[PDB]
Symmetry: D2
Subunit: 297 residues, 4 copies
């Protein structure tokens, strides 16, 4: 079998304080995930503003997550993607030496590689490290789609590519993947449809919502894995509202905003071109939050 990283996972926000990553806060937030039943954390993914972080800042976040998760079952699945293969290989290698348990590698954004290019991109990445590699398909952001065929071919040709984080709002593709390759780990990258993905044999979530509600996302995931579909569906339905409003502006603007409103972070800072939401959206976010029980530290 392949080595895998599954279960309830959080795409960690990266808190800033006067432009700099807030390291005490970051560690404090990770610890809060762990104490609320989360199985893995993802430093410096999309939700962690990877695009505007430096290479050094990636290292710092990965190291903090690794350190914090040390001596626990919680794994670190490090964001380590790029639209340049040489960069992506480099980032994977670095994540590996910093002690990450695996990497999440987003499909090349902006330059629209062909399916053949995608295949070689990921093959190079997978052959550069010996840790699990999770594909990440989010065509709304990247402008390309890793086809089911390409995903399956990568799973079958590269030993450490074990699955895909799917953020495409396409349940038909999920059926397709698991009908043809049942050894695949399909991971939900879309909070609103966590349950439908899990009930079709998906094996985890990489969640934005779990930043704010780690206990509910882990319970949902664990219920689903336990084949308690009733309880998992109940949680998924009650979370629908917040799962949508967290995208009323581009992620992670709403989640960071909500984290701040909840007193989980000290200051609401983004790195350009991300910025504070409109005062209207700030209100919409504050409105939905107050309808949920939020765990402190």
């Amino acid at each position: 079998d392949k080595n895998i990283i599954i279960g309830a996972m959080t795409a960690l926000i990266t808190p800033f304080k006067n432009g700099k990553v807030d390291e005490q806060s970051y560690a404090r937030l990770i610890k809060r995930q762990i104490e609320n039943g989360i199985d893995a954390v993802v430093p410096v993914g999309t939700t962690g503003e990877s695009a505007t972080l430096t290479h050094e800042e990636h290292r710092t976040c990965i190291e903090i997550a690794v350190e914090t998760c040390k001596g626990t079952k919680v794994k670190v699945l490090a964001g380590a993607g790029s639209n340049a293969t040489h960069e992506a290989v480099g980032l994977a290698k670095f994540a590996k030496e910093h002690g990450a348990d695996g990497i999440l590698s987003v499909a090349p954004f902006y330059n629209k590689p062909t399916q053949q290019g995608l295949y070689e991109h990921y093959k190079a990445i997978a052959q550069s490290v010996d840790i699990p590699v999770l594909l990440y398909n989010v065509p709304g952001r990247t402008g390309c789609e890793i086809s089911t065929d390409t995903i399956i071919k990568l799973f079958r040709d590269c030993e450490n590519i074990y699955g895909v984080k799917e953020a495409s709002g396409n349940i038909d593709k999920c059926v397709d993947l698991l009908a043809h390759e049942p050894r695949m780990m399909l991971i939900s990258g879309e909070d609103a449809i966590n349950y439908p993905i899990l009930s079709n044999g998906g094996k985890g979530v990489i969640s934005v919502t779990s930043n704010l509600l780690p206990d509910m996302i882990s319970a949902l995931t664990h219920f689903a894995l336990d084949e308690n579909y009733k309880e998992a569906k109940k949680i998924n339905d009650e979370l629908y509202n917040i799962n949508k409003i967290l995208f009323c502006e581009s992620n992670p603007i709403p989640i960071k905003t909500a984290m701040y409103l909840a007193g989980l972070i000290e200051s609401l800072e983004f790195r350009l071109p991300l910025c504070s939401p409109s005062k209207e959206n700030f209100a919409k976010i504050e409105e939905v939050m107050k309808k949920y029980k939020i765990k402190g530290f």
Copy 2:
């Protein structure tokens, strides 16, 4: 509190011979559905080439279904919709007059009414009969979408409107619908994702595939309704290839092609503008069919 028509349902093809409805074949095909565990049939829907049947033919097909199903538990959910409200109302009242147990009424195509018009459209239809009305949302065909809000208002405001056939490939909307209104009957109008819809609380399917494999579709649906999700998923996975190929060209072109190849209908005859599939797709359909056990008469 509502009267409903749920479970495994077939969108019946309409067989032609010499440019006419083959009335004997039609009755024979329906009997095959009855004997294979189907809970309801849908005469003159999209799969029955409703657009190209005359009024007298609409009648003929509904009567045959009504007469063939009499004395069995199998219901008739008649296709009766139009993009003109006075016509839709007329068809609704005719269907009831012919003895249909309920109606399936497609959102107005081509003229793109606003949500207010959709509401009034369906309110008028629902008030004209005293049998169950199921909404039918299929944006790719109609050019419009019944919003979740409109769907829920109609369900709550109109006594006989009891659910929606969703054919939009949007599992997010399905979560949305059942989270805000858990009492409605959400019916799958998309074969490949039957299981996901049912596993989220959907209560039936209106299937194209069941023309060919009524036993497998009824078993899938009944397993899911019995909360045997493992066996429902198993069947949905096996069906994925044929579910997919049955839409390689616009339905009902592939399903009729398959029915002809299976020897279930005499001729592969369509009414223009529908026609035989491409020879490439014909081959694909013929190949995919080999993997399944098709029931005869």
Copy 3:
């Protein structure tokens, strides 16, 4: 080839209702207004004319009124006669010819999504049924299907009657494609906001929603462009942008009928379900945009 054509500035006529029936006296008045403002042809019972909700008889009546009202003028009648059932479309085609239409506009089959092959046979059957010009109509946003460039060109070349296409797809690339491979066909704009770009690329006319309200401006635009006075045609197209967009704030013809009502050109603002009156807000928006334009009287 060398075909019989119907081109120039054309209006997709609205169908005024009074008390749930077609207002026939009003229909005639609106057509006279188009004629006197330089319009080259009128299209009775198109999408803008709420074709979907008219009866076969009302469809007849509208064509007859258009035919009688244009009699003795240079203005031609290009009757809507589309359907998603080929036998019905053939019937509507013969219908229109019999009632004196100079040509037909035939929309691509909506809802049932025929293949390119089925589209070809659909139009071939229609073309062979009458001896008057046939204009194709591609509006994918409404029908759920697109007639490809290949299919349009094949139809143009194989069928004597088919002389062009009304394109409402917002895809200027396809227009380039069409006229690059088949420079003999009449490409007609069915998208008002972009009449000028279509005309400047060799398009030969428009079938306009906006001309219902501003027939003098649309006809001026078209003739400037047809005379290669492109700078003047552009000026008008830019001036018309505001109203061209607002007329689709809700589905055509809800906004145009509302505007005709607001201009005092029709007696009542009535639609047939599932179409209905616009929201109060869009009513206000239409009213405000209209104030920037000179609207010809009766």
Copy 4:
């Protein structure tokens, strides 16, 4: 101050994994000798994603030196989805002697319109040279709205227009109807003529790597209001304009340049790679229809 007319989005030729610098200059010289008004080093067609910052600087400098003493201007690609990086790239381009910069909308991270606004304002405030916005939603996952383009044009003196690659002539009408002063630049070869005939003032072309003389003639005919001649060229070029997109740009253009003997090797940087054998043969076929100018 502006940069308009017929412009080329330069491909970046590789040799043994490195930028072939001699080949690069020779290509730019060929563009100059065929009537091109400006060249765009290291845009999307130049595989900007896969070049290091030093390679970026090198291409810009080679463009600047090669254009020295001619009327041809250098509009440098300097976009990024991180504002701190975009500003840095812009400032480097300026100190390398670029005449202006072409700055793509932040890709992947989907900024809000307010964020795009602050992003571009910061870029524009960082240099005193002209700045051309670049809208290509298909690649970035976001769109600079017409309102945002107009605000930025009006609020920042040196933001002078937008390269539009959205395949949406309606937006082009909207832009020039509400703000005619801006320079609308076609970023989509197949519809160069329609954009120019509506008041566009230039093209940033993929095709002109291969056929610089036809693209510049098209553009110049259009600017001279000779629409008949501009259309005729746009129509002739339609086949090549489409086939150059049968796979993601710049895969086809580089393949064609290779087949034409204009660059030495058909070499990309991953995740880009050679086209399929089918597309390769299709590209070869379409090329036979056009006269490809030499050096």
